[PDB]
């Protein structure tokens, strides 16, 4: 659904905590307005995983929806003595940041959100490793997503889950083995997933499955004024209670009572939504987030 991709799940907040000048169009992201922290993900040719799960949450959305927590320092200062907490973790990542960006966020190895930031008139370099002075007219108001990922809510416990990769000694900042032969190093696009009580879990394989449903989270409701989001909680179910009156597709009318003259809004079933599960070492689990990132991998020969 092309324009309904801006009808976000949850609150739809796509702002970073320290940059609130875009709140009019990022808090929340909806049909109207532009958002420097969100529109990046919908450019065709970029972020293929999120674009195939676009009705799920972004990293910023998962943070403001209490699904993902912030790092103990929520943002690292590149132009300091060290920029330490993110520096060692950012250098193993091969990233590309567009111009005029003051902040860039990523999923930590701890399953939390870290941010890389710069002074008010610096741009992030093309590798997101240094702060370069601004050669635009003005900076963007938001933060650039470094990884291609989507997120969801989950109570499935993954405290027993850990990275298992064939013949891999070091992937990113994770050392899996003691390798004393001399090794093969390369930048590999490695999938990963975060679980409730786990760290980041890299995988040889991305095996995902979706169970679609007719729960309220799988619907996009909207009204014409010119599109405006509508919350399905105001719609009465079949034999139910409603503060407003709605209509919709055959999927919505199968569970909610439909009225195709009076309607305040229209609800469509967001195809592609639902609960996503991933296979980790031969076991299906409900992850908090799933994504890719190009990072340094050392494999034994």
């Amino acid at each position, epitope marked *: 659904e092309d324009p309904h991709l801006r009808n976000r799940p949850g609150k739809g907040h796509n702002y970073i905590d320290g940059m*609130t000048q875009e*709140d*009019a169009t990022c808090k*929340p992201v909806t049909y109207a307005g532009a958002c420097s922290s969100f529109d990046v993900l919908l450019e065709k040719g970029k972020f293929p995983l999120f674009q195939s799960y676009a009705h799920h949450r972004t990293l910023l959305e998962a943070v403001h929806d209490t699904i993902i927590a912030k790092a103990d320092p929520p943002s690292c200062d590149l132009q300091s003595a060290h920029g330490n907490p993110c520096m060692k973790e950012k250098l193993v990542m091969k990233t590309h940041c567009p111009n005029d960006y003051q902040s860039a966020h990523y999923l930590n190895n701890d399953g939390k959100m870290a941010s890389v930031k710069c*002074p*008010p008139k610096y741009e992030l370099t093309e590798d997101c490793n240094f702060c370069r002075q601004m050669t635009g*007219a*003005s900076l963007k*108001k938001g933060s650039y997503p470094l990884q291609d990922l989507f997120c969801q809510s989950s109570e499935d416990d993954g405290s027993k889950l850990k990275t298992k990769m064939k013949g891999v000694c070091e992937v990113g900042v994770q050392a899996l083995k003691k390798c004393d032969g001399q090794l093969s190093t390369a930048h590999e696009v490695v999938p990963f997933a975060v679980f409730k009580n786990s760290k980041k879990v890299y995988l040889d394989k991305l095996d995902l499955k979706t169970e679609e449903n007719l729960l309220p989270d799988s619907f996009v409701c909207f009204e014409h004024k010119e599109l405006k989001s509508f919350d399905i909680s105001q719609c009465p179910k079949i034999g139910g209670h409603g503060s407003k009156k709605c209509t919709g597709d055959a999927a919505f009318c199968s569970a909610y009572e439909c009225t195709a003259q009076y309607a305040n809004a229209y609800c469509s079933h967001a195809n592609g939504s639902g609960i996503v599960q991933i296979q980790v070492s031969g076991v299906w689990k409900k992850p908090l987030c799933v994504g890719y990132e190009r990072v340094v991998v050392k494999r034994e020969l």
Partner: antibody
Amino acid sequence: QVQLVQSGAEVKKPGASVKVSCKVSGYTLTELSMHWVRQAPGKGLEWMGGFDREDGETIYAQKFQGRVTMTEDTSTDTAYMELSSLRSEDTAVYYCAIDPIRYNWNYGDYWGQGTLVTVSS
Amino acid sequence: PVLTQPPSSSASPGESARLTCTLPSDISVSSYNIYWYQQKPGSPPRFLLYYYSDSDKGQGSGVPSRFSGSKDASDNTGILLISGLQSEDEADYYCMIWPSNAWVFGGGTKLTVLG
């Protein structure tokens, strides 16, 4: 088009509380983030607090923290602002206000007409 | 953060008035949207326009294009420019920035169109 109407002028003894209203018409209150700004006579504007509806959290300024309380009546589209432990320096015109950037579609009111509150015994 | 505006400013009719809004040294004008309000006695403040950049800016409803905004990075100032000054423009003018959970207003500037 939004219409913001505040209650009438007030006189309160020092130490008591004052309660100001802002009635919203032409728009639904539960889609607006209402703020409050006061202005002592002949002086500048001062932000007192606001309610973030996207967050559902009420924020206050520290100069008033403990004294200013913000409620609402969704059935009447009316927001309320309560200031306690009134002192002589609290004499001001109290405005209910709306973010002009987020609500650039509105061609009606962004501020209330104002409510004068005099503190005297 | 304190926003300092000159207490008063004056210009002749037909000329251009330039009102400044200087920010402290620990924050930058380049980071924030800059609100500008016009307030006349007996009435609430009226939103003039906001300026962040030449591509991120907006004008208030019913506000003539004589009112425009800009920034000066070297002086760390937000600027409200009123071209073709007319008699009805004599009022108080406030600037506002929204960096965190607070509306921070400048001291206000009494602009007198020099009768």
